Amino acid sequence: ARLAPQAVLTPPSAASLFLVLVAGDSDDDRATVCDVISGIDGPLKAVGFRELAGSLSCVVGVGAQFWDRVSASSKPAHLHPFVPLSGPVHSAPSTPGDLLFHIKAARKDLCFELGRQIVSALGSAATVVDEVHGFRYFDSRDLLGFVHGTENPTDDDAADSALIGDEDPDFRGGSYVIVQKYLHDMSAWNTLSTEEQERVIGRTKLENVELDDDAQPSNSHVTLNTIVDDDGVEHDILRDNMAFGSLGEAEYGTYFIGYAKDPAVTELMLRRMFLGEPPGNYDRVLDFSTAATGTLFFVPSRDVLESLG
Amino acid sequence: ARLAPQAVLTPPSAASLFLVLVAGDSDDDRATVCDVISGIDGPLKAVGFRELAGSLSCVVGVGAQFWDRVSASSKPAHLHPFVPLSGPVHSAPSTPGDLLFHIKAARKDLCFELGRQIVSALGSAATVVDEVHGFRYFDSRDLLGFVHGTENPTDDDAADSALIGDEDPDFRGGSYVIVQKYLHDMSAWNTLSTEEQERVIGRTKLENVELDDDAQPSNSHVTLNTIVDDDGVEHDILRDNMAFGSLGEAEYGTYFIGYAKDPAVTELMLRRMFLGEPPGNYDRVLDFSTAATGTLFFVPSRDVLESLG
Amino acid sequence: ARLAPQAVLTPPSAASLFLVLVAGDSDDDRATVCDVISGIDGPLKAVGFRELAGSLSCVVGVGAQFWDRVSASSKPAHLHPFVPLSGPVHSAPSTPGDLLFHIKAARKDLCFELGRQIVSALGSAATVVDEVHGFRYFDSRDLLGFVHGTENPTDDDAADSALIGDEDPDFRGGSYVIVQKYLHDMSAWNTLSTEEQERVIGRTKLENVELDDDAQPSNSHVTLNTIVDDDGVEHDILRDNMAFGSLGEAEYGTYFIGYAKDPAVTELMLRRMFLGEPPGNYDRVLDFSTAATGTLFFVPSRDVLESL
Amino acid sequence: ARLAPQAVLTPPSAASLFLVLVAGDSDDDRATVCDVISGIDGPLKAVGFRELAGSLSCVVGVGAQFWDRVSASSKPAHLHPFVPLSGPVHSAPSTPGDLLFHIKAARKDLCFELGRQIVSALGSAATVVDEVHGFRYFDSRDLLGFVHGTENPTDDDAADSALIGDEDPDFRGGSYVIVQKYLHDMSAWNTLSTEEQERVIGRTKLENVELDDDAQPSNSHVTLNTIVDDDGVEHDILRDNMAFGSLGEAEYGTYFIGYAKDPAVTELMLRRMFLGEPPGNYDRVLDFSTAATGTLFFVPSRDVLESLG
Amino acid sequence: ARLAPQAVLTPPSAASLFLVLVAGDSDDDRATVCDVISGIDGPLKAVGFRELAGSLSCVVGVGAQFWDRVSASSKPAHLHPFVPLSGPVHSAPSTPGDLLFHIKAARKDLCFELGRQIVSALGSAATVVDEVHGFRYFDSRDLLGFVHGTENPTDDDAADSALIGDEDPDFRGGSYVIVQKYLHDMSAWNTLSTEEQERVIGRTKLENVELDDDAQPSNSHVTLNTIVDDDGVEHDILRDNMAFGSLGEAEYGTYFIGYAKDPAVTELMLRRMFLGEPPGNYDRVLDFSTAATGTLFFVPSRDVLESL
Amino acid sequence: ARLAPQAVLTPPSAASLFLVLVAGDSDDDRATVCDVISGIDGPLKAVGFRELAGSLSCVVGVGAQFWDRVSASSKPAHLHPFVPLSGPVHSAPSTPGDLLFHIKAARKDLCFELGRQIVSALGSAATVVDEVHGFRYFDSRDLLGFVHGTENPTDDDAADSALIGDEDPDFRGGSYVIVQKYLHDMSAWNTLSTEEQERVIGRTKLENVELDDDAQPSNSHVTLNTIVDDDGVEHDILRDNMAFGSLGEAEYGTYFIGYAKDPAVTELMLRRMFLGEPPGNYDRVLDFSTAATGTLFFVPSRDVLESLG
Numbered sequence A, B, D, F: 001a002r003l004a005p006q007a008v009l010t011p012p013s014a015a016s017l018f019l020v021l022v023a024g025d026s027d028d029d030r031a032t033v034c035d036v037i038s039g040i041d042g043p044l045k046a047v048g049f050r051e052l053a054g055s056l057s058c059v060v061g062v063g064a065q066f067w068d069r070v071s072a073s074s075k076p077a078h079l080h081p082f083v084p085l086s087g088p089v090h091s092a093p094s095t096p097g098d099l100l101f102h103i104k105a106a107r108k109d110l111c112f113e114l115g116r117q118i119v120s121a122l123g124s125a126a127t128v129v130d131e132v133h134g135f136r137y138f139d140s141r142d143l144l145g146f147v148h149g150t151e152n153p154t155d156d157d158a159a160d161s162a163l164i165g166d167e168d169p170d171f172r173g174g175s176y177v178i179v180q181k182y183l184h185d186m187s188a189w190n191t192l193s194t195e196e197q198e199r200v201i202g203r204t205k206l207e208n209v210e211l212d213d214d215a216q217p218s219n220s221h222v223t224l225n226t227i228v229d230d231d232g233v234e235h236d237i238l239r240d241n242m243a244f245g246s247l248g249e250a251e252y253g254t255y256f257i258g259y260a261k262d263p264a265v266t267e268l269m270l271r272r273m274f275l276g277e278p279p280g281n282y283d284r285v286l287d288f289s290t291a292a293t294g295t296l297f298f299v300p301s302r303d304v305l306e307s308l309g
Numbered sequence C, E: 001a002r003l004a005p006q007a008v009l010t011p012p013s014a015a016s017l018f019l020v021l022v023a024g025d026s027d028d029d030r031a032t033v034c035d036v037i038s039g040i041d042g043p044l045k046a047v048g049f050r051e052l053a054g055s056l057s058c059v060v061g062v063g064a065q066f067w068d069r070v071s072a073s074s075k076p077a078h079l080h081p082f083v084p085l086s087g088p089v090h091s092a093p094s095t096p097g098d099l100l101f102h103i104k105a106a107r108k109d110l111c112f113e114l115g116r117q118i119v120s121a122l123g124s125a126a127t128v129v130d131e132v133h134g135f136r137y138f139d140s141r142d143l144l145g146f147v148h149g150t151e152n153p154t155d156d157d158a159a160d161s162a163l164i165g166d167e168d169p170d171f172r173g174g175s176y177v178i179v180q181k182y183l184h185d186m187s188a189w190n191t192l193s194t195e196e197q198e199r200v201i202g203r204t205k206l207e208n209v210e211l212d213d214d215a216q217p218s219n220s221h222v223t224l225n226t227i228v229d230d231d232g233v234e235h236d237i238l239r240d241n242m243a244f245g246s247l248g249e250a251e252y253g254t255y256f257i258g259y260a261k262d263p264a265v266t267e268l269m270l271r272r273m274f275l276g277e278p279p280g281n282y283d284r285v286l287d288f289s290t291a292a293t294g295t296l297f298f299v300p301s302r303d304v305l306e307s308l
C-alpha cells in the first residue's frame, strides 16, 4: 500500500519520526492545521516519491480535544484524552497532544524531510511538544536488548486488531493509537542477570523464545499484556516501538506506540501493567522504565481525514 | 502483481522499454500477432522468472484499427485512434501504432531480453515504429530536473482512475493508454531561472513542493492538468514517465505514458495543455517539449487478452 | 503475507529447508506434536521477526495416517498416503512422513534457526526422517542447468490452483503438497547434447523459451506435465523446487515440492511421468533423476492448523 | 581498510556520530581516558564485527591541552587549541574539547552502539559537551540543498592532503581535524533565489556544476576556500560534513569536520571565510550559518594512539 | 580507487557509456577540448559524488593525430592510429576518433549525466562520432550467450598487463585502449548447435568452463587470443566488454574495449583473429560478428592528463 | 583481492565451503592434483566472474605428506602434519588430508559451483574426507550464541600475523592453516546461565564486550588464546570460523579455521586450550565442543601454487 496516508499496517522500518504537536487556540490556527492534515497526501508523495522503494509512510493522529474543534458533528465511539494512571510504585502521566505524525521509512533523510515540510506548513498554527527519532537497533531489539515487536499481529489478524470495523461504521478503517515515550535506567537493568531480565520480559533474551507456561511469572510483561475475555477470545494491539537515545544526556529509550480498533484493550494492558493484576502485582519492566509522555489519538481513515474542514 | 501480463498498477521502476509496432496487412500477420500477444505470459515468465525479485512486467496495448481487424463484434466503449491537436505554435501529432509493449523492470537486461523475445516471436508480422529505452534519473526526476510522478494516485485511487469498471463490464479491468515521446530543448530551458521553471511546472524544483494557489500560475502544468468536473469530482490519470536520450544526436527526452479508465480525461488534459484554458493559455512546458509521437491503445485485461483469436 | 503460518503462495527464495518427520506412537507424542504444530506461528515469529525484510515463511503439512490420529472426526476430501508408482523403467517410492515443514527465507540462518527451534520443541515426540537444505542456483536454475519454475501460476491463478475452495468448504484455504527428493546422474546428463537435453525438458536451455509445438517430443517433461480437461481448461500446480547436494557423496539434487487444491492433478502428472502417455512413453527426465522419497501431506489453513 | 581505528580516509557514510568530550581534572580520570582510547580498537571491533559489511569506523581526536597531560615528552609540530575568529560581521568561537570521536557507519544503530560503549567505558572520567547525529540527506546534500563534499580529494591525493608525512616523521599517518557545528537560518536562505544561492556557494544547485571562472564571485564559498601558494600549488582538506537537525527546536545543521596534515590550511580557509579576502569580502555562507562550536584535535596514527599511557 | 580519472583497473559494472569524439580543426577547438579533458575530474566528481557507493568512473583516451596536435614535444612509445586489417573473409576497419570516454557506473543515470556534462562542456569544439550504452546481461554474458570477461587478469596481473611501467617511464601509469563496436548476426549464430558455438569460443556455454586441450579447435576464439612469448610467458589484455543494441534496427552488439601497456599485444590478437593463425585459419567468431568501428587511443595517467 | 587464488586476507562472508581431500597413491593421481590446484585460477574465475560483486574466493592448502610427494627439495620452514593433543578429558585428534579448499562467497550457489568444478576436475585422483557448508549465523554469531571473529586482526596487522615474510623468503606470502571441525553439545551448554557462558568465553554474550581483567577467569577462551612472548610481543592468528549443522543428526557445529605465518602460535594456543595454563587449567569451551578433525596445511602464495609440477 504505497504512499497513502493512514497506512496503519505498514511492516517495521529502519527509521521513524514521532512528532506530537499542540494547536494554537486561534481560529486561523485551527484551519491552517486542517489544510495541512487533510492534504497530508501532498507532502507524503512530495518526499516519498523521491525514493524508488516508496518506503515512506505517515499516519496522522488527532487528539480528542482538537477533534471537537473541527468535527463536533461526528465522533468516534471511543475517542478521549489519555487516561492517566497512578499505581502503587509507578505512574503513567497523561501529557498534552493535539496532532500525532507517526512517520516511517527505510532512511532518516526521508523521515526528517517529511517532518520538516509538515512543520513548515503548520508555521505558528502549531507547536512541537515531543520529537522522537526512532531507529532499528540490530535484529529488531530495544535498548534493553530484547527482540521487540515479535508477537505483533500480521495481515488479516492485524487489520482486525487495529482497524475500526462494522462496530462503528462511520469511522471504518480508522484506529486509536496510544504513544508513551519511555526512558530506561540502564545501570539498574544491567545489575540484573540475563535470566532475571528474561523473567521480567517473558521471553529468552538472545533467542527470543517465549518461556514455558510453567516458568512464566504471573507479572512478566508478556502475561500482563495478554488479554483474554470471558468467552476465551484474545485481543491484540499493533505496536511500532522504536529505540531512541542521547549519549550526553544519558537517555536510552523505547518509544511505545500501539494501535487498536478500541483503546479499551490498550488501556486494560496499561492498567494491568501499572496497577498490577492481581492488584499490586505490576510489570517489573516499569522498574527500569519511566514513561515521560502519554497521549491518545484517533487515526482517521484516509476518507475521514481528507474530509476535515 | 507477480509476472502477470497487463499489470497496469506497477510501481515505478529503474528501467523500462516502450515498443510501438505496426502490424502487417495479411491474415497470417494478424494471426501471428494474436498468438504472440494472447500468449504474452510465456515470454514474460521465461525472462522474468530468472530474476529472484520478479520485478519484470509487460503491459500490452492494442490500437483502434488493429482491434477492429481482430475483434469486430465487441469493442471497448472508448477505443478510437489518438486525436491530434493543433495549437497555434505547438501540436500533438497522431502517429501510427497497432501494438504497445510497455515493459518495466529493475534492470535493463530484463526489459531488453523480453523485448527481444517478443520481437523475435512477431518476426515479419510486425515492424517497430518507435522504441524507447527508459531510465530512472536520480531521485525520480525527469531531464528538466523536476521530480516526476509525484501526484500519481496510489492503491485504491489508482485502480479507480486507471481501470475500466461498471461503465463497460465487457472490458472490466482493461485501461486506455496514451503515449507521446517528448524531446526537450535544453538550451531554451536552461536560459530560464529556477523560479521561472517552477512557475512553468507548478512545484518547487529541488524540494518538489506544490506552489500555493496564490503563486501558482493559471497556465502551470499542474493547474492545466488538474481536472475537476461540474459536480466537483476530481479525475486522475496514472503516469509511468521515464527519461530517455542520446547524447550524440542531442536528444533529451520524456516519454509520456498515461493510463485512464476513460481517455476523455487524458484528452481533456491534453487539450487544456495544447489549446489553453482560457483558450490561448497553453502549458508552457510545451515551449520546451515537443511531441514526436501520439498513439492511443486499449489495454485489455488478462482474460480478454488471452481470448484474442 | 508477513510471518503467517501456511503461506502457500510465497514467491521463490534464496534459501529453503525441507523437513520431514515421523511422529511417535505414544498419546503424549501425538499431543506434543499437536501442541507444536498448532502454535507454529510462535517460533515463526520468534525467528522471523529478527529480519527486517520479514522473508521467513513456514508451511506445515500433515500426513494421512497422522491426521486420522488427531481428527478422525473430519477429513479433507483428498487426503490419503502417497501412491507408489511402478513404471516400465522407473518407480516413485512412497516413503514415511507424518509432518512436513516447508521453510523459506532470504537467508540460510533463518531457515536453520526455525528448524532448530521446531525440532527442539518436538523433542522425543518426533523424528527427522528427511532433511534437505535447498538453495537458489544462479538465475533460478536447477542442477540440470535449466531455468526451473518458469510456468508456475501466479497471483489469482496460483490461489485458484493451490488453495482449497468451495469444493470442500470445511478445509477452505488449505492445500495438498507432494514432495520427492530427486538425485541426478550428472555424468549421464552430460553425455547428452544441449539440444537433446532441451528435447527432454521441452524448453531451450540458456534462454528458457518453450519449444514450439512441432519441435516438442511427445514425451518431453513439459508435454507430459500439461493437464487439460475435456472442456479444454488447463490445470496447474504450484512448485517450489530447490537445488541441493553434497559434493563428497556426489549427490546433485532437485527437491520436488508441488502444491494443488486437488492432488489428483499432481498425481496424474506423476502417473503420466512414470508410466508415460501413451503408456511406456515415460518422461526421459526420469532417465537422469531418481526419487529417493515420496510423501503426500495435507496443508491445513491457519484456522484449522491453530485448532488441531 | 576494515575496522581499524584512525582511518581518516573512509568514503562518505549514511550515518555519523560526532562526540566531543572534556576530561576530568582528576588523575584516575586521565588514566581511564587513556585506557579507553589507546584500546579503542576493542569496542570498534566489538560493535563493527556484528555487521557483515564492516562499515563501522572511529577516528579518535585528542585536544591540544589534554595531549599535554598524557605526552609532554613528544608533540606534533602543529598541535594547539582552535584559533577563534572575530571578523567584521561574523564570529567563529573556540569552544572546549579534549576528546573527539568521529564515528561513521552504514547504519545508525552501529554508530549509537559504539558511542554508547565509549561513553560507558569512560564513566565519570569524561563528560560529553557536544553530540551530533549526522545523516545523509538525499544525493549527498546539505540542508541548504547543495551537494556537499564534491571536491574532496580522493585516494593518493587525499592521503597527501590529510595525513602527516616526511615533514613530521614522529607522527606519520596522523592528521589534524577541525570541527564546527553550524546552524542555519532556513527562512533567510529561502528568501534568496536559487541563482543568488548558487553565487553564494560557487556551484549550480541541482546539477552541482562549478560556475565558470567569469561568473564566479570573488566571495563565493568555493573561491574563498581555494588555497594556492606562491609556487602555484593547491592545498586541500578532506571534509566529512553531515546534516543534522531538530524539528521542534527548529535547528537545521551542517556539521563541519575537516582533516589536513597541517591545520594552517584549514585555518587560512577559516580566515578567508570570516575575515574575508580582500579583507571585509567574507563568505556569504556565513550570513545563513552560525558556528556554535569550534575545536581542533590531533588525530594520532594507530601506532601513536595505542602507545598513550 | 574512488572518483579518480583514468582508473583503468575498475571492476565490471552494471552500466557503461562509450563515447567517441572527433575534435574540430580550429586552435580554439583544440584548446576547449584540452581544457575539458584536463579538468575531467570536475564533472566526474560533480556527478559521481551524488552516489553514496561512488561507482562512477571515467577513463579518457586520446587518438594519435590529436595527441600530435597538443604535445608534438613528447609521445608515448606506442601511440599510432588503429591499423586496418583485411583478411581472407573479414576485415577490421580503422575509423575516426580523437577522444574516448569510457564511463562506468552502477546506474545508467550516472553514466548518462557524466556524458551530458562532458558533451555540453565540449560544445562546438567536438563531435560525437560513436556512442554506445552498454549494459550487463544476466550473469556477465554477451548477446552470443557466453560468460564474457572470465579470464581477465586481476589485481597485480591486471596492472602489469595494462599499465605502462619502466619500459616508457615518461608515461608511467598510462595505457593503450582499442575499441571496436561489433554487431552480431543472431540468426546465423542460432543455426549453430550449442556444441558448435562452444567450439567457436573455446569454453562451455552455460557453465563457462574452458574446453580441454584436445577438444579445443585451433581456430577457437580462446586459442587465437592466447599470446605466449618465446620464453613461455603469457601476455594478457584487460577487456571491459559490454552488451548493447536496438530491437527496432535488429542490432545486437558486443562493444569490444581492450587495454594493454603495449597495444602490440592487442594488435597481435587482432591479426591472429582476422588473418588467422596459421594464415587463413581465422576466428570463427568473425563469421557472426562484424566490427563497425576500430580506433586506438592512448590513456594518459592523471598527471599527464591534468597537464595536457 | 578480486578473483585471485590464495587470498588469505578476505573479509567475512555469508557462505563458505570447506573441502578436505586425500590424494590417490599413483603418479597419475599426483599429476592430476598438481594440474588442478596449480590451475585453480581457472575454475575460480569461471564461476566467480558470473557474479557482478566478485565475492568468490578460494584458498588452497597442501598437507605436509603430499607436499613431499611433489616438492621434495624445497619446503616451507614449518610444514609438518597436525600435532595431536591428548588432555585428560578432551583431545585434538590429527585426521587425514592432503588438500584443503577454503571457499568463500556471498551466496551458497557460488561456493557450491566452485566445489563442484574442483571435485569434477580431480575426478578419481582425490577423495573428499571432509565437507562442510558454512553459513553466517545472525550478527556474526556462532551456534553457541556469541559474536565470533571479533578480535581478528585487520589490514596491516592481519598481513603481519597470517603471511610468511622474511623468516622464510622462499615462501613469502604463503601461510599455514589449521582446521578443526567442532561439534557442540547444545543441551549441556544451555544448562549454563548466560553469565557462566560469558565466563567460559571471556566476553558478554549479546553486547560482545570483553570482560575486564578482574572478572576474566584465567581459563577463559579469550585468556588462554592470548599469546604474549617473553619480549612482551603479542602474537595473533587470523580466524575464518563459520557455523554449520544438520538438524536431523543433531549436529550443531563450529568450523575452526586459523591462519598463521608460523603454526607454532596456533599450536601453542591449542595446547593452552587442551592442556591448560597452568597445566590442567583447560578451556571450558571444550566441555561443550568436540573436535572431529585436525589437519594442518601449507597455503602457498599464488606464484608458488602455479609452479607445482
Ligand code: HEM
Pocket: B142, B144, B146, B147, B148, B149, B150, B151, B152, B180, B182, B201, B203, B221, B222, B225, B226, B237, B239, B254, B256, B258, B266, B269, B270, B285, B289
Ligand atoms: C514533456 C512532457 C511532460 C513533462 C516534463 C511533465 C512533467 C510533470 C511534472 C514535473 C509534474 C509534477 C510531478 C508529478 O505529479 O508528476 C507533472 C504532473 C502532472 N502531469 Fe505532466 N509532464 C509532461 C507531460 C504530461 C502530459 C502530456 C500530461 C497529460 C496528458 C501530463 C499530466 C500530468 C498530470 C495529470 C500531473 C499531476 C497534476 C496534479 O494533479 O498535480 N503530463 N508533470
Ligand code: HEM
Pocket: C142, C144, C146, C147, C148, C149, C150, C151, C152, C180, C182, C201, C203, C221, C222, C225, C226, C237, C239, C254, C256, C258, C266, C267, C269, C270, C285, C289
Ligand atoms: C527431477 C525432477 C524434476 C526436474 C529436474 C524438473 C524440471 C522442470 C523444468 C526445467 C521445467 C520447465 C520450467 C518450468 O516451467 O518450471 C519444469 C516444468 C514443470 N514441471 Fe518439472 N521437474 C521435475 C519434477 C517434476 C515433477 C515430479 C512434477 C509433477 C509432479 C513436475 C511438474 C512440472 C510442471 C507442472 C511444469 C510446468 C509445465 C508447463 O505447464 O509448462 N516436475 N520442470
Ligand code: HEM
Pocket: E142, E144, E146, E147, E148, E149, E150, E151, E152, E180, E182, E201, E203, E221, E222, E225, E226, E237, E239, E254, E256, E258, E266, E267, E269, E270, E285, E289
Ligand atoms: C564480437 C566480439 C567478441 C566476442 C563476442 C568475444 C567473446 C569472448 C568470450 C566468450 C571469451 C571467453 C570468456 C573470457 O575469458 O572473456 C573471450 C575471451 C577473450 N577474448 Fe574475446 N570476444 C570478442 C572480441 C575480442 C577481440 C576483438 C579481442 C582482441 C582484440 C578479444 C580478446 C580476448 C582475449 C584476450 C580473451 C581471453 C582468452 C584467454 O586467455 O582465455 N576478444 N572473448
Ligand code: HEM
Pocket: F142, F144, F146, F147, F148, F149, F150, F151, F152, F180, F182, F201, F203, F221, F222, F225, F226, F237, F239, F254, F256, F258, F266, F269, F270, F285, F289
Ligand atoms: C568450538 C570452537 C571455538 C569457538 C566456539 C570459539 C569461539 C570464540 C569466541 C566467541 C571468541 C570471541 C570473539 C572473537 O574475538 O572471535 C573467540 C576468540 C578467539 N579464539 Fe576461539 N573459538 C573456538 C576455537 C578456537 C580455537 C581452536 C582457537 C585456537 C587454536 C581459537 C582461538 C581464538 C583466538 C586467538 C581468539 C581471539 C582472542 C583474543 O585475542 O581476544 N578459537 N573464540
Ligand SMILES: [Cl-]
Pocket: A016, A017, A108, A111, A112, A115, A133
Ligand atoms: Cl527524523
Ligand SMILES: [Cl-]
Pocket: A239, A241, A256
Ligand atoms: Cl511494546
Ligand SMILES: [Cl-]
Pocket: B016, B017, B108, B111, B112, B115, B133
Ligand atoms: Cl531495453
Ligand SMILES: [Cl-]
Pocket: B239, B241, B256
Ligand atoms: Cl506526466
Ligand SMILES: [Cl-]
Pocket: C016, C017, C108, C111, C112, C115, C133
Ligand atoms: Cl537450513
Ligand SMILES: [Cl-]
Pocket: C239, C241, C256
Ligand atoms: Cl518441477
Ligand SMILES: [Cl-]
Pocket: D016, D017, D108, D111, D112, D115, D133
Ligand atoms: Cl548515533
Ligand SMILES: [Cl-]
Pocket: D239, D241, D256
Ligand atoms: Cl565543507
Ligand SMILES: [Cl-]
Pocket: E016, E017, E108, E111, E112, E115, E133
Ligand atoms: Cl548512458
Ligand SMILES: [Cl-]
Pocket: E239, E241, E256
Ligand atoms: Cl573480449
Ligand SMILES: [Cl-]
Pocket: F016, F017, F108, F111, F112, F115, F133
Ligand atoms: Cl556449498
Ligand SMILES: [Cl-]
Pocket: F239, F241, F256
Ligand atoms: Cl575462533
